Amino acid sequence: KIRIKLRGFDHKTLDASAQKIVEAARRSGAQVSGPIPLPTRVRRFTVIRGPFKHKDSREHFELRTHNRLVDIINPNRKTIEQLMTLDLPTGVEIEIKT
Amino acid sequence: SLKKGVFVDDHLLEKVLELNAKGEKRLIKTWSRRSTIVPEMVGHTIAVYNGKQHVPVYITENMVGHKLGEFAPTRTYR
Amino acid sequence: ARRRRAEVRQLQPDLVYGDVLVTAFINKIMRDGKKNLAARIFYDACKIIQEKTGQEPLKVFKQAVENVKPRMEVRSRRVGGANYQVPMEVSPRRQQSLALRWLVQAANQRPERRAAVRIAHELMDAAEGKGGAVKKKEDVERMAEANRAYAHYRW
Amino acid sequence: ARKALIEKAKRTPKFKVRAYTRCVRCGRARSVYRFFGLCRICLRELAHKGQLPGVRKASW
Amino acid sequence: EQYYGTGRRKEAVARVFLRPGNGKVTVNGQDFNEYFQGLVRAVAALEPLRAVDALGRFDAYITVRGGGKSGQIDAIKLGIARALVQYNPDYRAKLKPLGFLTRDARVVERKKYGKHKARRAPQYSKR
Amino acid sequence: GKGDRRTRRGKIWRGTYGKYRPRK
Amino acid sequence: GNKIHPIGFRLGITRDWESRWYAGKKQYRHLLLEDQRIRGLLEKELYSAGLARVDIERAADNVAVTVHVAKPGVVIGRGGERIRVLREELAKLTGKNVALNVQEVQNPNLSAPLVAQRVAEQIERRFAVRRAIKQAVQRVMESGAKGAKVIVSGRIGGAEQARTEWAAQGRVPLHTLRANIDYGFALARTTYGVLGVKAYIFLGEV
RNA sequence: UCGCGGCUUAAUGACCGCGACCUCGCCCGGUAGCCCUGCCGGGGGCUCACCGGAAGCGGGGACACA
RNA sequence: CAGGCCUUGACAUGCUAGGGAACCCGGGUGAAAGCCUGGGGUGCCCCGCGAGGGGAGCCCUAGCACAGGUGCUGCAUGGCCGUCGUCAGCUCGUGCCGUGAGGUGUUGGGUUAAGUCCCGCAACGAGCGCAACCCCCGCCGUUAGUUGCCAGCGGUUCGGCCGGGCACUCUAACGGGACUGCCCGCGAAAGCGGGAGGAAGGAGGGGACGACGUCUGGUCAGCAUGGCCCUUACGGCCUGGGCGACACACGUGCUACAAUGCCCACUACAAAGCGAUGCCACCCGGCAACGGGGAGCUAAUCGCAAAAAGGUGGGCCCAGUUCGGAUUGGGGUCUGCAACCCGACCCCAUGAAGCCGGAAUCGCUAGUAAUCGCGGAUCAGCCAUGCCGCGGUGAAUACG
Ligand SMILES: [Mg+2]
Ligand SMILES: [Mg+2]
Ligand SMILES: [Mg+2]
Ligand SMILES: [Mg+2]
Ligand SMILES: [Mg+2]
Ligand SMILES: [Mg+2]
Ligand SMILES: [Mg+2]
Ligand SMILES: [Mg+2]
Ligand SMILES: [Mg+2]
Ligand SMILES: [Mg+2]
Ligand SMILES: [Mg+2]
Ligand SMILES: [Mg+2]
Ligand SMILES: [Mg+2]
Ligand SMILES: [Mg+2]
Ligand SMILES: [Mg+2]
Ligand SMILES: [Mg+2]
Ligand SMILES: [Mg+2]
Ligand SMILES: [Mg+2]
Ligand SMILES: [Mg+2]
Ligand SMILES: [Mg+2]
Ligand SMILES: [Mg+2]
Ligand SMILES: [Mg+2]
Ligand SMILES: [Mg+2]
Ligand SMILES: [Mg+2]
Ligand SMILES: [Mg+2]
Ligand SMILES: [Mg+2]
Ligand SMILES: [Mg+2]
Ligand SMILES: [Mg+2]
Ligand SMILES: [Mg+2]
Ligand SMILES: [Mg+2]
Ligand SMILES: [Mg+2]
Ligand SMILES: [Zn+2]
């Protein structure tokens, strides 16, 4: 039915922010689908490493947005109680939409 | 290029239309080279500006659908 | 390579003949990563073979490779003063490469104009003995074996 | 001329083509990123310090 | 029912489903030789069944995906073998004299900065 | 070849579209 | 043209990002501007307390600006008022709820961003340079660490030729990813130039 | 966190013995926000986040939900 | 660079101070900047129905310290980097030897990618290096399924489109797996030659990683910075030009010089990506670039998007040609205030040099070379054939 979507950067806090939410909406009523790890979005960008004259042999960085969604299937007020109030990520953008 | 504009200037256009008042003087010192030779408003010699000075191009009917910057050549060694 | 033996890339067996000489000939025909056109050229070439001569599609080609296969080939070695051009006998695992490369060069320089008929008229004349590739073989086996005077450098 | 230009990048009451983006920490006018806004040098010395979240030395 | 197998090669993947079936194969809702139409190496994919010599018993529905034609062909060449190995003890020890179960992970190797195609260094002045 | 602007491959190399390389 | 930055070499593993937050292309540049400007306020104007790092977070409009200080006695205030005025300063450049959590270090010599600053204070206080280096490494080992290395770069000792002096006690395994070598860097802005103090502190491995 | 002796030191340490203390309440007093029938003003709840007066302080060094 | 101009100035404040204090609207001169210029005129500190006055932000004037410098110096420097070179090394503690510099350790034979390891040894250890710890790509498993597939009665807009549903491919976490692990031959041991099983072999393949230091390497023009120099100019603003010029020379690439090739049509087959003032599906118009509607997308959901090479069957017929696409003229579309210097494309003419290249030289040891397209960055457009990535087809050879 309704989805909650979790972007962010560190997956090691993201999975502990998502499996917590799976456990919380389990503990607050009926069942909800697990963490569906839809693919990460890798913003790569390259940089001539030295400041002046070093075009060959340069460095490049990556920026991995980790997206993970959870499909809430029966949204009771009991679910919104321990879900929409009890919002605790740390650097993770959660967004709740149909 | 450029089929949706007359691409003449808000000061070159004003000066040539004011100098076409029944015939008038000849000095018009422009800096904006980008403007075209104002079609059916030829005749007055314009001092275009290649950067070093003002070259006084006498504009003729064979040069009407061109720009003013063609007649201020910007370099030596043709 | 310098350190190790540098073992050869094991090829594939071919499809329609199941042979290993023919795949190296596909590779020597193959221009700029175009094997689906190169082996296409070879199978049109054996079609022209079956049209012209009542032989096998593979036998005239294998006998052409054998009758272009060199034995004594000349290699240069600088031995002071004037760099001598020493003859030496060739491993068959290099004779196959030299033979197929000569076949492709002489077939591409061969004065016919279409792809597979150049190889057709080249494999016919090389299996006969009067082709440009066997001419090049006799050229190098007359460079060597008449350049036999400096053969005491085996290296 | 860079203390002029790092404010000329701010002010635009004239035409909107002259809004070239300039770097944020330094004042470089080349290789400034439509992401972060740092140039490539400020990007390298902030990605190595760790003041950009998510960025990381890449190897794929 | 399904003698299923996986298969993947060179970022071309393959889901082979060997049927108990008479004599044909198919691919992705198309005919076999209308998918691989006129490749001289097209029928190099079916080379498991012509060498487990079990060709006269099996159909193969195939969803093959990604990569290119001759990458998908080698994906099928792995797929038929890894599919018919699965329901079998003795269709297994055949491919070690064939190589027909190894993904062959020679992939298109990653381009390196300075070079052009991960090995091709630029031309060299030295002057 | 590819530097040409009035063919198929000469337009796919320049990237754009035209009478010689159309849009479907 | 060597030795990449041993924070950013670790950065994915064994080491957190010093500013961790999130948004896409819309507000990443706009967050990074205020995230640099907060640090340009702090590191310029909190240096007397000796701040090591400025861990900056925001979940949603809760800017945790938690800093790492050796001595919070001039970044909090007597009972706390410099913390108050500094939070009303942090409100002036970003309007959000800028919760500034000062956090002290567990040993102010196992933190390379303050050892390097202490060496920089010695150079700007005109002390003997290699005496300061071989003292700072010894004070790090008496605090107790697995290995240190204080590279101090050129114009050293008021000279004209600019050699680089350094001293180590213990092991500094830079190329080992699991090592957790903390790294600090601090300029020294005395009369004879810019003395660039670096310091590596090899903490517990794995 | 600061004086005085020393541990510890090279200036200086981190650490001890008292002292100038602190804030938090166990010691006291006031201010102020809501939870609401949608709009404010009159009874409870007590919360000191804010602040003055504090007997020893239980403590640590300079901070904060209901 | 040329010209118009501004001066404590685009700015950072901080002071003396009549003034206006937050600020909006224009007119004229002008290439613009600038300069000259007229109409509305401030909650608050306030004592205020008072005249008002001290006086708090901000702003303009006259000044002040000063700002500013892409001015010089990378042999004054930091920072960062290229480099020798991912090369196998450089050292130290202690002991010994040597008057000492300095050995020794680190030599020797063996061995590897390696100063890697073992056996002897005045050495015994240790540090930075190597290796490994990290990541991708390999296989397998657990979790998870708005991607994914017909296995299922079966609807059927007759379509992955759904109705049933996740089997898989996948996705991205967490795990396992490969270690000489086994066995044989050689070997003092390390290890080497081979075999088996495995998906994989003896660093499985690639990344990131680059020691002590050298080149007084490069950068004061990314920044920071000592010093000296400019301070109504070397600073600042703008308009226009230049950075694109061209007698030639060089370096790197791109297309070519063709029939394995070229042109038209048609049908396939990718990963990587990137997009709310953007991507633009799908129509209409225009041969076309594009233009006018407008769907979807806050994106594994919609879009760029066509993939190209391939394949299909039609043309060309060894021709400077239906090779080549440089040039020049014309018709135009977009961006942008502005395409003349100098943008990109579209179309129609033009059709040159060039028929595999001197002496020399470079690149490459496996998905590599070669050939083919695609994406991204910066970005209004774009110089892009470049760079950074992605995949498609995919070789020959390494005797030594
Ligand atoms: Mg001689
Ligand atoms: Mg061979
Ligand atoms: Mg621009
Ligand atoms: Mg490639
Ligand atoms: Mg043509
Ligand atoms: Mg289509
Ligand atoms: Mg001085
Ligand atoms: Mg003034
Ligand atoms: Mg000098
Ligand atoms: Mg330097
Ligand atoms: Mg020594
Ligand atoms: Mg002695
Ligand atoms: Mg070693
Ligand atoms: Mg490996
Ligand atoms: Mg120099
Ligand atoms: Mg300077
Ligand atoms: Mg300079
Ligand atoms: Mg600067
Ligand atoms: Mg100037
Ligand atoms: Mg230039
Ligand atoms: Mg070239
Ligand atoms: Mg063509
Ligand atoms: Mg993009
Ligand atoms: Mg429209
Ligand atoms: Mg996407
Ligand atoms: Mg995708
Ligand atoms: Mg033209
Ligand atoms: Mg050539
Ligand atoms: Mg020569
Ligand atoms: Mg691209
Ligand atoms: Mg360029
Ligand atoms: Zn920058």
UniProtKB/Swiss-Prot annotation, chain B:
A GO biological-process term? translation
Molecular function terms, GO-annotated: rRNA binding; structural constituent of ribosome
Q: Which UniProt keywords apply?
A: Ribonucleoprotein, Ribosomal protein, RNA-binding, rRNA-binding
Name the GO cellular-component terms.
Answer: cytoplasm; small ribosomal subunit
The annotated subunit structure for this chain is: Part of the 30S ribosomal subunit. Forms a loose dimer with protein S13.
Q: What's the stated role of this polypeptide? A: Located at the top of the head of the 30S subunit, extending towards the 50S subunit, which it may contact in the 70S complex. Contacts several RNA helices of the 16S rRNA.
To which protein family does this belong?
A: Belongs to the universal ribosomal protein uS19 family.
Could you tell me what this protein is called?
Answer: Small ribosomal subunit protein uS19
Record organism: Thermus thermophilus (strain ATCC 27634 / DSM 579 / HB8)
- The organism's lineage? Bacteria, Thermotogati, Deinococcota, Deinococci, Thermales
Q: Which gene encodes it?
A: rpsS
Curated annotation (Swiss-Prot), chain C:
Cytoplasm: present as a keyword of the record? no
Q: Which GO terms of the cellular component aspect does the record hold?
A: small ribosomal subunit
What CDD domains is this protein classified in? uS7_Bacteria
Does the UniProt entry include the keyword tRNA-binding?
yes
Tell me which domain of life the UniProt entry assigns to the organism this sequence originates from. Bacteria
InterPro entries xref list = Ribosomal_uS7, Ribosomal_uS7_bac/org-type, Ribosomal_uS7_CS, Ribosomal_uS7_dom, Ribosomal_uS7_dom_sf
Q: Which GO terms describe its biological process?
A: translation
**Gene Ontology terms for molecular function:** rRNA binding; structural constituent of ribosome; tRNA binding
Q: What does this protein do?
A: One of the primary rRNA binding proteins, it binds directly to 3'-end of the 16S rRNA where it nucleates assembly of the head domain of the 30S subunit. Is located at the subunit interface close to the decoding center. Binds mRNA and the E site tRNA blocking its exit path in the ribosome. This blockage implies that this section of the ribosome must be able to move to release the deacetylated tRNA.
How it assembles, according to the record, is: Part of the 30S ribosomal subunit. Contacts proteins S9 and S11. Binds to the C-terminus of IF3 and to the C-terminus of Era.
Q: Which family does it belong to?
A: Belongs to the universal ribosomal protein uS7 family.
Q: What name does this protein carry?
A: Small ribosomal subunit protein uS7
* Species per Swiss-Prot/TrEMBL record: Thermus thermophilus (strain ATCC 27634 / DSM 579 / HB8)
Write the gene name: rpsG
Swiss-Prot record, chain E:
Offer one Pfam family short name for this entry: Ribosomal_S9
User: Does the record bear Transcription regulation in its keywords?
Assistant: no
Biological process annotations from GO: translation
Q: What InterPro entries would the database entry show? A: Ribosomal_Su5_D2-typ_SF, Ribosomal_uS9, Ribosomal_uS9_bac/plastid, Ribosomal_uS9_CS, Ribsml_uS5_D2-typ_fold_subgr
Which cellular component terms (GO) are annotated to the entry? cytosolic small ribosomal subunit
Record-level Gene Ontology MF annotations: rRNA binding; structural constituent of ribosome; tRNA binding
Please verify whether the record's keywords include Transmembrane helix.
Answer: no
The source's domain of life comes to Bacteria
Keywords for this protein: Ribonucleoprotein, Ribosomal protein, RNA-binding, rRNA-binding, tRNA-binding
Quaternary structure, per UniProt, is: Part of the 30S ribosomal subunit. Contacts proteins S7 and S10.
Q: Which family does it belong to?
A: Belongs to the universal ribosomal protein uS9 family.
Question: Function of this protein?
Answer: Part of the top of the head of the 30S subunit. The C-terminal region penetrates the head emerging in the P-site where it contacts tRNA.
HAMAP family reported in the protein's UniProt record: Ribosomal_uS9_B
Protein name in the entry: Small ribosomal subunit protein uS9
What organism is listed for this UniProt entry? Thermus thermophilus (strain ATCC 27634 / DSM 579 / HB8)
Gene name of this polypeptide:
rpsI
Swiss-Prot record, chain G:
An annotated GO BP: translation
Superkingdom to which the source organism belongs: Bacteria
CDD domains named among the record's database cross-references:
KH-II_30S_S3 (cd02412)
Citing just one GO molecular function, the answer is: mRNA binding
Which Pfam families does UniProt cross-reference here?
Answer: KH_2, Ribosomal_S3_C
The KH type-2 domain is annotated at: 38-106
Q: Name one GO cellular component term.
A: cytosolic small ribosomal subunit
Q: Which family is this protein grouped under?
A: Belongs to the universal ribosomal protein uS3 family.
Quaternary structure, from the entry: Part of the 30S ribosomal subunit. Forms a tight complex with proteins S10 and S14.
Q: What is this protein called?
A: Small ribosomal subunit protein uS3
Question: What species does this protein belong to?
Answer: Thermus thermophilus (strain ATCC 27634 / DSM 579 / HB8)
Protein's gene: rpsC
